[PDB]
Design a protein around this ligand. Sequence first.
Ligand SMILES: O=P(O)(O)CP(=O)(O)O[C@@H]1[C@@H](OP(=O)(O)O)[C@H](OP(=O)(O)CP(=O)(O)O)[C@H](OP(=O)(O)O)[C@H](OP(=O)(O)O)[C@H]1OP(=O)(O)O
Ligand SMILES: O=P(O)(O)CP(=O)(O)O[C@@H]1[C@@H](OP(=O)(O)O)[C@H](OP(=O)(O)CP(=O)(O)O)[C@H](OP(=O)(O)O)[C@H](OP(=O)(O)O)[C@H]1OP(=O)(O)O
Ligand SMILES: O=P(O)(O)CP(=O)(O)O[C@@H]1[C@@H](OP(=O)(O)O)[C@H](OP(=O)(O)CP(=O)(O)O)[C@H](OP(=O)(O)O)[C@H](OP(=O)(O)O)[C@H]1OP(=O)(O)O
Ligand SMILES: O=P(O)(O)CP(=O)(O)O[C@@H]1[C@@H](OP(=O)(O)O)[C@H](OP(=O)(O)CP(=O)(O)O)[C@H](OP(=O)(O)O)[C@H](OP(=O)(O)O)[C@H]1OP(=O)(O)O
Ligand SMILES: O=P(O)(O)CP(=O)(O)O[C@@H]1[C@H](OP(=O)(O)O)[C@H](OP(=O)(O)CP(=O)(O)O)[C@H](OP(=O)(O)O)[C@H](OP(=O)(O)O)[C@H]1OP(=O)(O)O
Lengths: 361, 363, 370, 368
Amino acid sequence: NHVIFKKISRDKSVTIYLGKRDYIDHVERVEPVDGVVLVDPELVKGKRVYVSLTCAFRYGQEDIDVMGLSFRRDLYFSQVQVFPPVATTRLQESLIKKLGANTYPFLLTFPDYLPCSVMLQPAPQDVGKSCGVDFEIKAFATHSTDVEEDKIPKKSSVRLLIRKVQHAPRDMGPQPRAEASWQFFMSDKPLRLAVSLSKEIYYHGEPIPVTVAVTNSTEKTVKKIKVLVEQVTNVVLYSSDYYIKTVAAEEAQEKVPPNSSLTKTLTLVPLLANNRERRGIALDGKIKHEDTNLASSTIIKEGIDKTVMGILVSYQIKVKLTVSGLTSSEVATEVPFRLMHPQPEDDENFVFEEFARQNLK
Amino acid sequence: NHVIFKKISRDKSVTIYLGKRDYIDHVERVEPVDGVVLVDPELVKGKRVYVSLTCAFRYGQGLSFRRDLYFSQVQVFPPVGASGATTRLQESLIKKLGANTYPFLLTFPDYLPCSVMLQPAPQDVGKSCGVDFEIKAFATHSTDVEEDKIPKKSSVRLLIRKVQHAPRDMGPQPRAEASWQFFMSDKPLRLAVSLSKEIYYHGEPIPVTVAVTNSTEKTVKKIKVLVEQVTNVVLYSSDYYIKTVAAEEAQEKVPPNSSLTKTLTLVPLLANNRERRGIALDGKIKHEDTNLASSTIIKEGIDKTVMGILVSYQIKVKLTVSGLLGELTSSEVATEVPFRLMHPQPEDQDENFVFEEFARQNL
Amino acid sequence: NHVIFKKISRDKSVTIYLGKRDYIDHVERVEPVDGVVLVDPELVKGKRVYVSLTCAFRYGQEDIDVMGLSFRRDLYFSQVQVFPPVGASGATTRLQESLIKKLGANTYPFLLTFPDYLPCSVMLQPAPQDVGKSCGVDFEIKAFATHSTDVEEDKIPKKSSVRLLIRKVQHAPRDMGPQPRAEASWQFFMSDKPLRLAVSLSKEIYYHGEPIPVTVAVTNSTEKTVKKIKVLVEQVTNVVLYSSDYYIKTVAAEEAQEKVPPNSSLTKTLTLVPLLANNRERRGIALDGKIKHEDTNLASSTIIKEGIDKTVMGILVSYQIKVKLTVSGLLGELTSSEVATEVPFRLMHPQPEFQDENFVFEEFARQNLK
Amino acid sequence: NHVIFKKISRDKSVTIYLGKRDYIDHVERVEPVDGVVLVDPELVKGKRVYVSLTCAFRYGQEDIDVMGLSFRRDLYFSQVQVFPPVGASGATTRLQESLIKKLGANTYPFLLTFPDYLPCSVMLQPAPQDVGKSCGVDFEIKAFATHSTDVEEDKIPKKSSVRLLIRKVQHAPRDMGPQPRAEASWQFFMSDKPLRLAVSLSKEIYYHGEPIPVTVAVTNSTEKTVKKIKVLVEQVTNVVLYSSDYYIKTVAAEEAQEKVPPNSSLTKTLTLVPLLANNRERRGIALDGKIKHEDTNLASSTIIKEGIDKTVMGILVSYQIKVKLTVSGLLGELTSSEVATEVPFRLMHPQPEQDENFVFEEFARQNL
Ligand SMILES: O=P(O)(O)CP(=O)(O)O[C@@H]1[C@@H](OP(=O)(O)O)[C@H](OP(=O)(O)CP(=O)(O)O)[C@H](OP(=O)(O)O)[C@H](OP(=O)(O)O)[C@H]1OP(=O)(O)O
Ligand SMILES: O=P(O)(O)CP(=O)(O)O[C@@H]1[C@@H](OP(=O)(O)O)[C@H](OP(=O)(O)CP(=O)(O)O)[C@H](OP(=O)(O)O)[C@H](OP(=O)(O)O)[C@H]1OP(=O)(O)O
Ligand SMILES: O=P(O)(O)CP(=O)(O)O[C@@H]1[C@@H](OP(=O)(O)O)[C@H](OP(=O)(O)CP(=O)(O)O)[C@H](OP(=O)(O)O)[C@H](OP(=O)(O)O)[C@H]1OP(=O)(O)O
Ligand SMILES: O=P(O)(O)CP(=O)(O)O[C@@H]1[C@@H](OP(=O)(O)O)[C@H](OP(=O)(O)CP(=O)(O)O)[C@H](OP(=O)(O)O)[C@H](OP(=O)(O)O)[C@H]1OP(=O)(O)O
Ligand SMILES: O=P(O)(O)CP(=O)(O)O[C@@H]1[C@H](OP(=O)(O)O)[C@H](OP(=O)(O)CP(=O)(O)O)[C@H](OP(=O)(O)O)[C@H](OP(=O)(O)O)[C@H]1OP(=O)(O)O
């Protein structure tokens, strides 16, 4: 029972059908956009219909009594002709049969040098504005003299904001633990902190087992041990904005007294659900939408300038130790890991729905 | 030479006189409705006459949805207390009309919208809606212990306007900056837009200064500047209208690696629009004194929904760029700058009165 | 039980009484000098007695014999007549009324006011290492008798005079500056990675003897170790009359025990108390009095009033917290410089606030050390 | 004859002597720093004296009741030993041999070389209107003495040290090809009628103080009038470390008298000289030194070497000729249109080229 997503132009001349809202990037390759356009042949007589895939970085938000700063960089544009008709997929063949002889297929492919769906709406505390990377599928009709005035009439056009979602690659090597250790000399006596994760890549919703090994050879007491998942966001187009937000936290009970050692494994789950405040954090969609999650770790390909990703998103485990004096001192350290969606999957019956995404309560 | 507006009940028992058709809202306060009722003392014997001010939102062409936003009522007959006029207009009208003339004062609060209404075009989904202001003078009587009655024939209703005039304050000089980097181009196209001020008056020309800095290898073929009216119905139905009420297409092109500064002047006017449907007006399409609706001014700590219809204006600047549309984009290169549109600031022996029917002139 | 300070002239003809040795400047206004002069009416017969308030900057040693050894700039002079009694002659303040009653009918009041454009008690005696000489701002209260001779020359004998070196002490205003904060970062030669130092104090004004909590946040993203974190209170002294002398001296230092290893951060609060007591060597530092005296402290921060030329302050005194980070494999290898930042703060004394009082009398001369 | 620049440590134990304040970068190579250190052998007994060359980018300024934001990136560090005399600078120069003879046997030579990947002396103090802070690239020559346990306590005592802020000045290379005119043209269609603007400079590289002849050729085939022709030298400054600050300032301007009426053409040559002297306001512009100093000029054009990331230059400085044409409104308007175009050029100092007689001066630079 395959759910198909449809949207219709104002003038009802062009209707677009997609198999998915979300298209999978699994590093090796990206799932292409295969869909169909249903034209009203009366309302398209002597007209040409195209479908475009645009990836664009945007920066700026509407503020009263504040100068309107807007900025757009297109990171990819591609366009094909659907009408008049110029290999097909099985989804297209099936949709054409179900919809009629006014149905025409399109295939738009993604390249390997694009980011995934990342966007950010700032909090009151934050300097810097709303920014994001959008993916638009737009089907539109041109007239014969419309190309001659360079005009693309709105009522004959339909646009869909699809997501490019980061999944893990399908074949992966065995995963080395993500582990570091530090020796904090205090009065020439070492306080040793070792932090270790089970693996390097975790999935959204998957629990992260953080093993913390405090070896205290000092005459000071470790009063408190806090473990965070921090999300680090670097806007690398237009404005060098920096965000660092806790998306999961555990403050253990333990003290580590002088000349003793303590090993402890806390489990954290970095989830958007944990965060009442959904602003100041990199998401893969709008705050209002239900299917919106935390942004996956940016995966910069070799010999690609990171600036063309628009927004860099990374995750790290932060361990804060509160150490006594005779006011106390805090030491902290970071262990990086990557967060993304699971590996992808190794007649018909179509139910049709509006593309518009569901909201929250 | 003060023109006074009069209307008489069917039964000629109640006649209402107003100084104005239109009452000024200038944000700080709203001009109250000061008028007089002339009763035929024979035809109101043993009867009570009241005057009411009702503000209501309506939606539909039978009668589909009504929300009352304000109601107030006073007694004119028999005379309440002192019964002496409050304003000079009343004192003067009482003297000119006779001892059967009785004053009324109905005040506006600060939480109401101004006269806004909308009749949709064929292309538009959603129905006729508006905010009406009714001044109604009517007589009540009793022929039974069990009920009072309000005959229609003893009543007279006037549809006044609450017109938005400018405050003392103005917002900061509105300015926008936008830049685009098109696919495979290392070079930005920069658009800066500036207006002289934040508040313009109906009929006043709007000087839109446009600064196109073209560092690209493409040509800016066209620069179009619009005044767009944005209408949001915020009661019953979330209807949205966006209509051009003024447009100017500059002659200049901006070639590669050049910049052009240019000031286009627009005047957003109802007169510019043959099609008077699909746009927020301050009155009915048929009436002569009807204009474009003024910008809604929502007061602090007032829920916008009680305004019924939100009206805003913006300058839109569209750049048509060579060899993208089809090749490198399916989108439009445009930015918006908001501004407010309303009527000018207010100006801050006896008179000579000419009397006219309240009914408004047509086209 | 109010202690009153008295000094008597050599010839015992003029005795001066003050409520205080030290008079409070709290920025808004300055405490005036209210005192009384007790004359021996036999020894002042046909004579006039005056009291003067002089503020003067000096540079050099004190003039000896006839030699001008010193450079002197008078910053303020005022004088009043105490004898014979001027007009009403009745006390102005309660301290005067009370002293007159206790001492007798040969007691006469004086009031000398301070203006708003003067510095506070600041002086400096240089160390061997220092170039530049002894300098200071003195405040002299001098009561003296004049008489006339047969030739029309008036005389002012030293034996008929008494001079007191009072202090003008800086107490805090009502206002305080914003919480002082600094941020510094370094990227060393051949390093892609910053070393970030953030420094914060609890407040902008501290009092003499009050502990200063210096919060230090070292974020070390480098592959080098922060071997040492040293926190100083530095006193910066600028002589702005006669000679452009400059002194910068540590008056408090704390060396934290913690190191900050590669790819770690450390937040830490060290407490310092800038005190003259901490300094064995009392030379090369701005004091509010002489080294030998007990009640002598560090000079308060100079507070220059708006539209007053700083040169008329004579000696400018300021304080700052300096944080020095010692980083492994730099000094000699990647830098010949120091990794440090400064945060300014002001140091001064705390804010100010039917029967007679009970008076104990003491010599004005200040106590010394042991 | 030869003026030598000297500075002495507080404790008079170390004195440094340099041939120049300013060392020439002419793209091919950079003039090395050859000098001598005069030690007081009593005050350096059992001590080691070094001389370092540091190039550092700095960002931030002291503001009252404002948080102190400071940032330093070292772009080059090098150090040699002068005392005791175990030879480090290798072979000697004639300037050193001569200074050693004139000063005595307590004089020791040092040679510190510049690499090819450094910027030249550039710094900037912002104006009120400007958003970002003071920044610059400094070049420090520092001679300092260490004790035997000073290296062990990581301490460099200030009184035993002397630091000089030298300049790295951008001169033109010695061999250059013949110079093509720097010329562009634009066609501004107005109502489908072209307004043609051609701008031409004599050459691509000009020297500080050299006049720039800007030839402007307006061919007006439109029905509009060119009311005004303004020609500027604009300095464009991009801070490319810590903060992406941008400055664009006029350092020379000429507003011609001429109008160009409909269906006519006008050629005209204005001469501009971009000079710091022209600018009362010395803030918001890239200089090669401090505002207060006399020998301070406008910063030379940054010259980015092949395969060098521009970010390691710290501050990018470029110059351009801007031509603004004011074109009339047509049928009785109350505002006219401005079109403008830029022509880039580079600004720098001219190409470079027995016992001497030495006069000694304090290194400290003269003021205004
Ligand atoms: O987020 P969803 O789209 O699932 C909810 P909704 O319908 O309200 O979204 C509208 C969207 O309309 P459409 O569904 O694409 O036809 C608008 O799009 P259109 O009317 O189709 C085209 P537009 O951008 O208005 O020119 C525009 O979309 P977007 O720019 O935010 O993606 C609005 O944005 P804005 O008015 O807040 O600026 C956005 O509003 P919002 O989501 O905040 O309610
Ligand atoms: O509208 P106001 O009362 O403020 C002043 P006016 O005298 O002009 O109003 C009459 C109206 O009178 P009333 O409501 O019976 O007192 C008519 O009312 P009636 O014919 O008696 C029906 P109503 O009383 O409105 O329920 C009818 O009202 P409407 O059609 O505009 O609603 C007329 O319009 P139309 O006959 O030209 O179409 C309308 O005149 P308009 O100014 O709109 O031209
Ligand atoms: O829904 P609304 O009424 O608000 C918009 P509408 O359909 O009227 O507008 C287009 C307009 O472009 P746009 O849709 O506003 O962007 C066209 O604009 P273009 O001249 O093609 C270029 P634009 O899209 O404005 O940049 C041109 O009108 P106009 O804007 O020139 O007045 C069209 O008219 P036509 O000459 O193709 O028949 C006109 O359509 P029509 O008047 O037929 O309904
Ligand atoms: O120019 P500034 O005043 O800012 C520093 P300078 O080189 O003059 O001061 C040093 C000081 O160095 P620093 O304060 O850590 O930079 C020494 O300190 P370190 O090199 O850190 C020795 P430490 O291990 O801290 O005792 C030690 O001063 P300190 O120890 O009393 O603070 C010295 O004095 P000494 O006791 O060796 O004669 C003292 O010399 P002085 O200025 O008195 O001539
Ligand atoms: O700059 P020149 O040497 O040409 C003139 P001057 O003798 O007045 O130099 C002072 C002085 O430098 P030095 O180390 O004693 O030679 C200062 O020296 P310190 O601040 O005491 C040197 P330190 O901190 O010990 O390294 C500081 O030197 P610097 O800024 O050039 O490094 C001043 O600069 P700043 O603080 O105003 O910016 C600097 O210039 P000023 O502005 O006072 O005229």
